[PDB]
Amino acid sequence: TVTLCSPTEDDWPGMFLLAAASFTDFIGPESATAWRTLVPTDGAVVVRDGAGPGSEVVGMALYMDLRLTVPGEVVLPTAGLSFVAVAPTHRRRGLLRAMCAELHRRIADSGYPVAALHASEGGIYGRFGYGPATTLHELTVDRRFARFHADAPGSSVRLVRPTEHRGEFEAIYERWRQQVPGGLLRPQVLWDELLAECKAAPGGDRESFALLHPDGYALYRVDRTDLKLARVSELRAVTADAHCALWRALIGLDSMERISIITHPQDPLPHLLTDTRLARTTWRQDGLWLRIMNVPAALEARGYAHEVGEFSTVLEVSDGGRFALKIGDGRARCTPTDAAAEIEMDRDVLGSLYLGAHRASTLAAANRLRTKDSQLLRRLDAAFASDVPVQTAFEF
Template structure:
């Protein structure tokens, strides 16, 4: 697709912000409030915003912000978080998004950052740019009235009711401990915490202000929604550093007597249903992607994470969008990897987006191979790859950016 000659792509200026806010508002169906503007400007430098213009009028934008993600094994890896990707409805199918992303990813490559990440409003857009879904989230609803815990389920206690001021003092430290052991979770700037505790009413979706349950090793934020005869506890965030904290918080949530249902987004393999007498009680209403990853530097990314078994293989990683692919010798010993470009014959082949899906352990090599997203020279090659890229802890996105 050829970009219209009247359309140019450039770095944004401070004077562009009103037009950029309007573009984003139209694209995502909301009008920014003062807290939104405060958060955006705190997280974003104007020079990290790319804008497309038609005869000088902004008609598209994309930006990236500095983040740090935990990968399997606990290493903290620098990343750039891509967000505010918007194209005016008047300029669809004219190559604007591709032109924006070419400019943006040249900027990201220049930083030397191994990973680029985003959360996708539409799942069909970003694979062609080398992004693969790297975490999976399940929306779950529980009829709280019938929630009974097994006799052998842990009951560690330790949960307290907490006001907003106390939560603001306690939660950031708990989150930081949790994200440093959780693949996919990222650092959380103070500006984002301030926005969370500010809890703008316009984004409560008709619910109450936030309530907080805290444990020395975890917390839950929830709000009440619905009518008096159909009250719902909508859990906005549940973080547990330990299994005891997880069990204690769920016992407290299930003790909210007036609530008919609990709604939560969690990892599909969350242990809650295994603690209940009725395995079917937590009902999954939606299963979807959450974090998407693009590997910007294959050797640096693969050497950053840990692995479950020793491995000697040669990967052919195809990147049809940029030039981050190639053939790489990957050697793993005692959990640590060495990765270098090579002229050897590949044993494993995949596109870059498949490597992004494999990277945090959320998707397995066997599943990707069944979908013809990975090809292997032998069953043994595939089996070892599948085992090696496993992770001790489930991958979860920390907060939506």
């Protein structure tokens, strides 16, 4: 019958086929071979139908070696799940469950404190311990009315061809990803992939341009259907000045009516303008999802807010251990215990708290996180918050 194992190079065509059929956006077998370099030996699982040769791939899943920045500018080795897929012929046969269990086992044994993914659908991954941990926020600016506020900072920005300033983009992004929770190291192979997208595609996307600043850049292109809409695919700013200067340039695209960007909830853009409504939220969705693999390792690794007095509690993760958790001076100490729990939550809830994108008090109101103490709740809220708001580095 069905069997779970690590793919051979023989299994690839089957996997590419399943991938082509599962993901519209499938980047070709070629492009899939850049991401492959991020897959460790043993980072992939397939389900074959039958035993023997000529068995076909009906399930696949893999993880990539990533580096995720978490609050306090700490970088965690992170296992990024990707290309997860079950054949349309084998739904509801337990394949996803078996493949995820096997991959989590490998991820845990390998020593990753956290796993992560982007969710094709919202009701799938909670059951596997993943919680949404960043929030994608689309802003659409009607630039026809947009005027900058007297207080806004600001000729330092240049309009450039992306493919001619790779080094400058890499250096800026690299600084960006080390300072911001949600940041991911972007390897050379992914910079190759990204820069190849910049050329105009006949029957596809119009060519991309870049706005470059010593401390930030934006990549944008005119929408293919709506020609009065500019789409900002990526904007990395490491200083507030760079962020403002880049927006002055984008609002300077007089040929356009609207500029849109997928950004984060605390993007200060609306406050740069004299009319904050002009920056409309047109779309909101979960971004990066997190599964805490090792609770103590993860809790001790991140920084915590200093604006909270030292406190101690006992945290129980459903089927993930019980811990004495002490937080003070922006650090956590997290040790085994069997003392009565003061806070309980499923594993996924913890990943949702972990980068500061969700407040413990909000999850508590949903009974997703249970405690006796309201004071304890406010303290967790305050401790887990992030100085630097969490952003999403790139889908994978």
